Design a binder for this molecule. Structure first.
Ligand SMILES: C/C=C(/C)C(=O)O[C@H]1C(C)=C2[C@H]([C@@H]1OC(=O)CCCCCCC)[C@@](C)(OC(C)=O)C[C@H](OC(=O)CCC)[C@@]1(O)[C@H]2OC(=O)[C@@]1(C)O
Ligand SMILES: Nc1ncnc2c1ncn2[C@@H]1O[C@H](COP(=O)(O)OP(=O)(O)CP(=O)(O)O)[C@@H](O)[C@H]1O
Ligand SMILES: [Mg+2]
Ligand SMILES: [Mg+2]
Ligand code: NA
Length: 994
């Protein structure tokens, strides 16, 4: 029964055919259980370790790699010779990476919470109901409760389902609904029907929401909905339907996969089309089998050189490091892939209270009526000092300190602030600061009465824990608070019924002290107070009060204004029903206006600046606030969102105004608006949706489960540190300090991290290109394999891994925040850069093949057989080309390979330097610009020698030490790469910029 809040109490019982006294009969329970199912959200989809491991092999690249582990395996088997010490190494190395890859992948899934599963923290195990099969109450499992049965909840209980309250047994019922309505103050529940069938949860004052807590009292009610039909259930379904896309990088990396896999196959075909010359050879002769192994062998190499095996780990390493660095700035990122997307932030939708502002309320102006005499009218405007909650400050008129007591209006003004309040101050012996007890708004009032001290009550003698609520006490001792009519959004005011203290059996003197939003309260005033006297509210004077209020709330003061008033002749105690909030407004009629107080919720001292960085970064900032439209714009102009005098007609909307617009015009509004006030539950989510239709990477804030859907949907959901765990688990980032500026700071870090990743990413893929040139060259030509798998793998995981990781620390640019947000569709490599890496690759393809073929031609220590046509044969099934001399295994000489491997390695340490900057020569930006790079290149070489002299290794890698002569040829072929890049960089600077 979704609409239970709008139905009468008798209507719900009638609807479910149940009696309040007996409860449901076992037949009903059974029948209802089958119609509505159990009261619980569906279980998470169980993903098994097996399935969690099989997924690790879904990526195109880890599949190609696996395939190569097979070909390599098979070959390692059906191979000639007897060296099994290095034979099965190639396949086992590949497999190990595929294993560590799985282990890591699976490891992440074990420890990784999900928002949906976090909601279940709010469903209790048990609940208490009354069923026709037993007189007494019986506590059962929440899972077994059903729509229709009578339930009982008491203070401490966690509501097991969405319940329509039938009767409140205690005196009053208070509920902690924080997780659902964001209301941190417990709210009072009634049993009268709430008329609007379309009322939002906050106004359903006759409902208990599953997952909430009974703050105080005891009540009986009928279950309206259960499971996924509850408020928290509907939130669970919205989240499950929300699908977060893959980050721009992940997508680029995915497209790279398909293509790399598509190129690897075309290079194979090619190597085949270049060896078609074998179809013109006699069937007899030639060791075919020793030719098939050659193709496959290079195929494996083809793949191993094409796949940047170490990239994923570098990215991760760099991301962990940035993350730890962002934490230092209070920005807690939960998803490493989010650091990127965060830098792309196009829009930032932020809540005002506690994020843009401090939520440290302080009254700083107040006014009463000075006198009324016909058309003439004068008010008494005042000012207060002290922005804290501490009773340290003072009232001043025309800037001159006065004593409140000398004015009567202020005595009463102060009475109202003290009595019509549920808040109090408390001095922390520890922090030595006065804390607030209750709503920030009411505490500001409490703080005000202490400063005013209408009765001059000497308090300087009193301690600090006493100074706290001194003047208040004085006022409480004067009037007796008989009861209070809670605040409610419909009437936007609250009041307390009071009777004098020192008074015997009397039927006169009772008063009501009303406080609330000015327009509503002032409208219910038929009288204005002047000191101690009273006269009829006149059109004019009502304008005077209203204009000042408009000035304080709409003007630069951006003050939250409150009208204070009294009902001199309130109704008789017995003539009031303190059960139907709906009658509270009438009770607060025929009032007497006493004055206004305007408090300030100050903007964080860093937001103005952060708002400016956003404008500089081309990032739009949208404010979402509970304030009315006028004050919301005023605050927006104040913190810089809007210009002091710019037109914002169609750039700020209220929830109501927004709903009235047709879908088409709502979408349009969302591209222009920077201010949303009085926004509905479904709005944050709709705004995100509209923003995404314009392809903007959105950042949205929130803290309760009710914000969870929106947070999940926004590219970057931002949760408050002080918010719920659900909001946190549903978000990409958590603000440890709740501060808006912490967001902007995180965005810049996000831009700097990616610029670096772009460098080490292009660096790594750049080599993989060269490696694949060498393999294709050393094949289409038919030369001895220049480089082999086990070697390449070391270069891509260790040799090139270090420089890459160091690259992640390149200093960031200065105008990092003077540039607009990066387009997600922006490729990492294209245009001239593509050509640059095209050439560089062709170069590394030669520099390797050459240094290998060099040692087989013009090299001393090696077959100085120049032009000996290594091409001619690798069969030696003839030995004819070489008359005298029995030796055909020097083709496998490890000396040349070392030349290729040292060339690669050397060039990559060089290319790592060509990476410090995309287009700046090493002239303007020297290698020492990143000391971590240098130190990293020093470590990569010390590791190169490590595998050259430490016996166990040189064999495994098929390597041998080099001559100081040869090492020079390595340099004479590597070091030039830098000049090559410099020419290319140069060409891009002064011949393609503009
Ligand atoms: C990794 C190694 C190699 C050799 C590879 O196949 O890279 C290609 C490839 C798949 C792309 C290319 C390589 O393309 C070529 O070399 C063109 C064909 C001629 C090959 C002849 C070989 C003898 C990248 C690497 O290189 C250069 C130097 O042009 C740049 C870029 O890559 C990126 O932007 C990186 C994405 C994370 C991609 O065009 C990319 O495809 C895409 O979808 C992109 C957008 O991704
Ligand atoms: N305890 C209280 N007593 C009387 N009036 C109050 C009040 N708290 C707020 N008001 C008045 O009611 C109007 C606001 O309604 P509400 O209190 O729900 O909004 P808000 O400004 O507190 C944001 P949120 O609803 O998100 O907490 C305020 O602008 C103020 O004038
Ligand atoms: Mg409020
Ligand atoms: Mg919230
Ligand atoms: Na999200």
């Amino acid at each position: 029964m979704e609409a239970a809040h709008s139905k009468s109490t008798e209507e719900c019982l009638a609807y479910f055919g149940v009696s309040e006294t007996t409860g449901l009969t076992p037949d009903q329970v059974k029948r209802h259980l089958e119609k509505y199912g159990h009261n619980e959200l569906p279980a998470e989809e169980g993903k098994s370790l097996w399935e969690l491991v099989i997924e690790q092999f879904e990526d195109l690249l880890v599949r190609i790699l696996l395939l190569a582990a097979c070909i390599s395996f098979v070959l390692a088997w059906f191979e000639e010779g007897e060296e099994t010490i290095t034979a099965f190494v190639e396949p086992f190395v590949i497999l190990l990476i595929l294993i560590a890859n799985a282990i890591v992948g699976v490891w992440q899934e074990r420890n990784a919470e999900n928002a949906i599963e976090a909601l279940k923290e709010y469903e209790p195990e048990m609940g208490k109901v009354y069923r026709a099969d037993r007189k007494s109450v019986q506590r059962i499992k929440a899972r077994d409760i059903v729509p229709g049965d009578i339930v009982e909840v008491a203070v401490g209980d966690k509501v097991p389902a969405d319940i329509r309250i039938l009767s409140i047994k205690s005196t009053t019922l208070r509920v902690d609904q924080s997780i659902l309505t964001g209301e941190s103050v417990s709210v009072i529940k009634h049993t009268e029907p709430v008329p609007d069938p379309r009322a939002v949860n906050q106004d359903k004052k006759n409902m208990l929401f599953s997952g909430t807590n009974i703050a105080a009292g005891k009540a009986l009610g009928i279950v309206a909905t259960t499971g996924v039909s509850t408020e928290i259930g509907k939130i669970r379904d919205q989240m499950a339907a929300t699908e977060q896309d893959k980050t721009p990088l992940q997508q680029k990396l995915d497209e790279f996969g398909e293509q790399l896999s598509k190129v690897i196959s075309l290079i194979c075909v090619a190597v085949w089309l270049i060896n078609i010359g074998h179809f013109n050879d006699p069937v007899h002769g030639g060791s075919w089998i020793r030719g098939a192994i050659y193709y496959f062998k290079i195929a494996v190499a083809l793949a191993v050189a094409a796949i940047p095996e170490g990239l994923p780990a570098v990215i991760t390493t760099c991301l962990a490091l940035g993350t730890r660095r962002m934490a230092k700035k209070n920005a807690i990122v939960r998803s490493l892939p989010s650091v990127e997307t965060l830098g792309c932030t196009s829009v930032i939708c932020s809540d005002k209270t506690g994020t843009l502002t401090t939520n440290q309320m302080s009254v700083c102006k107040m006014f009463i009526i000075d006198k009324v005499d016909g058309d003439f009218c004068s008010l008494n405007e005042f000012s207060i000092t002290g922005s804290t909650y501490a009773p340290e400050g003072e009232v001043l008129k025309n800037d001159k300190p006065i004593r409140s007591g000398q004015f009567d209006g202020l005595v009463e003004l102060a009475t109202i602030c003290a009595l019509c309040n549920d808040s109090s101050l408390d001095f922390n012996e520890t922090k030595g600061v006065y804390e607030k007890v209750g709503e920030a708004t009411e505490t500001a009032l409490t703080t005000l009465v202490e400063k005013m001290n209408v009765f001059n009550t000497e308090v300087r003698n009193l301690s600090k824990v006493e100074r706290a609520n001194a003047c208040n006490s004085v006022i409480r001792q004067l009037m007796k608070k008989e009861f209070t009519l809670e605040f409610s959004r419909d009437r936007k005011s609250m009041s307390v019924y009071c009777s004098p203290a020192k008074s015997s059996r009397a039927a006169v003197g009772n008063k009501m002290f009303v406080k609330g939003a000015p327009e509503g309260v002032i409208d219910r005033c038929n009288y204005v107070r002047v000191g101690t006297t009273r006269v009829p509210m006149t059109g004019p004077v009502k304008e005077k009060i209203l204009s000042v209020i408009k000035e304080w709330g709409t003007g630069r003061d951006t003050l939250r204004c409150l009208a204070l008033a009294t009902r001199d002749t309130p109704p008789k105690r017995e003539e009031m029903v303190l059960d139907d909030s709906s009658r509270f407004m009438e009770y607060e009629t025929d009032l007497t206006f006493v004055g206004v107080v305007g408090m300030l919720d100050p903007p964080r001292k860093e937001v103005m600046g952060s708002i400016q960085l956003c404008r500089d970064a081309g990032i739009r900032v949208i404010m979402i606030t509970g304030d009315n439209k006028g004050t919301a714009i005023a605050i927006c102009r104040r913190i810089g969102i809007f210009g002091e005098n710019e037109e914002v007609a169609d750039r700020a909307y209220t929830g109501r105004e927004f709903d009235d617009l047709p879908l088409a015009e709502q979408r349009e509004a969302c591209r222009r608006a920077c201010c949303f006030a009085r926004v509905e539950p479904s709005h944050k989510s709709k705004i995100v949706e509209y923003l995404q239709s314009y392809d903007e990477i959105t950042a949205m804030t929130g803290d309760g489960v009710n914000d969870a859907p929106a947070l999940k949907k926004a590219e970057i959901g931002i949760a408050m540190g002080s918010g719920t765990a659900v909001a946190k688990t549903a978000s990409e980032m958590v603000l440890a300090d709740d501060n808006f500026s912490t967001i902007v700071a995180a965005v810049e870090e996000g831009r700097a991290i990616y610029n670096n990743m772009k460098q080490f990413i292009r660096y790594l893929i750049s080599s993989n290109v060269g490696e694949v040139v060498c393999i294709f060259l050393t094949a289409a030509l038919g030369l001895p394999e220049a480089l082999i798998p086990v070697q390449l793998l070391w270069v891509n995981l260790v040799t090139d891994g270090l420089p890459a990781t160091a690259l992640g620390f390149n200093p960031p640019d200065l105008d990092i925040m003077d540039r607009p947000p990066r387009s997600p569709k922006e490729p990492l490599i294209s245009g001239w850069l593509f050509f640059r890496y095209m050439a560089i690759g062709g170069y590394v393809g030669a520099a390797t093949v050459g240094a290998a073929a060099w040692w087989f031609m013009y090299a001393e220590d090696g077959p100085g057989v120049t032009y000996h046509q290594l091409t001619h044969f690798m069969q030696c099934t003839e030995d004819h080309p070489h008359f005298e001399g029995l030796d055909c295994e020097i083709f496998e000489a490890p000396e040349p390979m070392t030349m290729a491997l040292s060339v690669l390695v050397t060039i990559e340490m060089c290319n790592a330097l060509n990476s410090l900057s995309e287009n700046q020569s090493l002239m303007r930006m020297p290698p020492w610009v990143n000391i971590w790079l240098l130190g990293s290149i020093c470590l990569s070489m010390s590791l190169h020698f490590l595998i050259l002299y430490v016996d166990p290794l040189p064999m495994i890698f098929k390597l041998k030490a080099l001559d100081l002569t040869q090492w020079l040829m390595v340099l004479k072929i590597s070091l030039p790469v830098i000049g090559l890049d410099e020419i290319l960089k140069f060409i891009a600077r002064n011949y393609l910029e503009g």
